Structure 1
Amino acid sequence: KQDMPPVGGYGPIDYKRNLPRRGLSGYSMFAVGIGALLFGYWSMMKWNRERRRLQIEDFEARIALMP
């Protein structure tokens, strides 16, 4: 008279399905995104506009001498 089922009580644990979480949806992206790309170029247009300022300085010595 030793058999399995307990006196009362159990779960259950469900079978259901959910795993949908976001995550900056629905045009929130395309908003930050195009915002970074610009600050990329604004970081250019200055380094590259400074480096030319040195470029001329370098061709200067060449023309300075060479008589």
Structure 2
Amino acid sequence: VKQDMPPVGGYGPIDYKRNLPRRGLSGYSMFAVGIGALLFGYWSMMRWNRERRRLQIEDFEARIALMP
């Protein structure tokens, strides 16, 4: 009897293909996402700055009335 090492009935395949998914996101849509978040930040910052301008006008009234 002989006890070498052949492949047992043959061997299965091994792929050799370059797996790169090119994901992606359709980058014009990523520009849309970035400009949307940018404009969201601008609108919220705009509202908060103008209300802090209101309260700073109240502080101006404090220094005006308190002075004499």
TM interval, shorter chain, is: 0.7 to 0.9
State, as a whole percentage, how many aligned pairs show the same letter.
Answer: 99
- Misfit runs of 4+, over 6 Å: none
Instruction: Return 5+ residue gaps in structure 1 as ranges.
Output: none
Bigger CA drift: 17-26 or 37-46?
Answer: 17-26
Bigger CA drift: 56-65 or 41-50?
Answer: 56-65
Taking structure 1 as reference, are residues 8 and 64 closer, same or farther at Cα in structure 2, changes over 3 Å only?
same
Please report the TM-score for the alignment, with normalisation by the length of structure 1: 0.84
Taking structure 1 as reference, are residues 26 and 54 closer, same or farther at Cα in structure 2, changes over 3 Å only?
closer
Taking structure 1 as reference, are residues 26 and 47 closer, same or farther at Cα in structure 2, changes over 3 Å only?
closer
Instruction: Return 5+ residue gaps in structure 2 as ranges.
Output: none
Structure (1/2) with the larger helix percentage: 2
Taking structure 1 as reference, are residues 26 and 56 closer, same or farther at Cα in structure 2, changes over 3 Å only?
closer
Question: How many residues are treated as equivalent by the alignment?
Answer: 67
Does 1:26 find its partner at 2:27? Answer: yes
Please report the TM-score for the alignment, with normalisation by the length of structure 2: 0.83
RMSD of equivalent CA atoms: 1.5
Kindly provide the CA deviation profile for residues 6-64 of structure 1, in whole angstroms up to 9, marking residues without a partner as x: 34131111122122241312412111111110000000111000001011101112111
Report the Cα distance in structure 2 between the residues aligned to 1:29 and 1:7, rounded to whole angstroms.
52
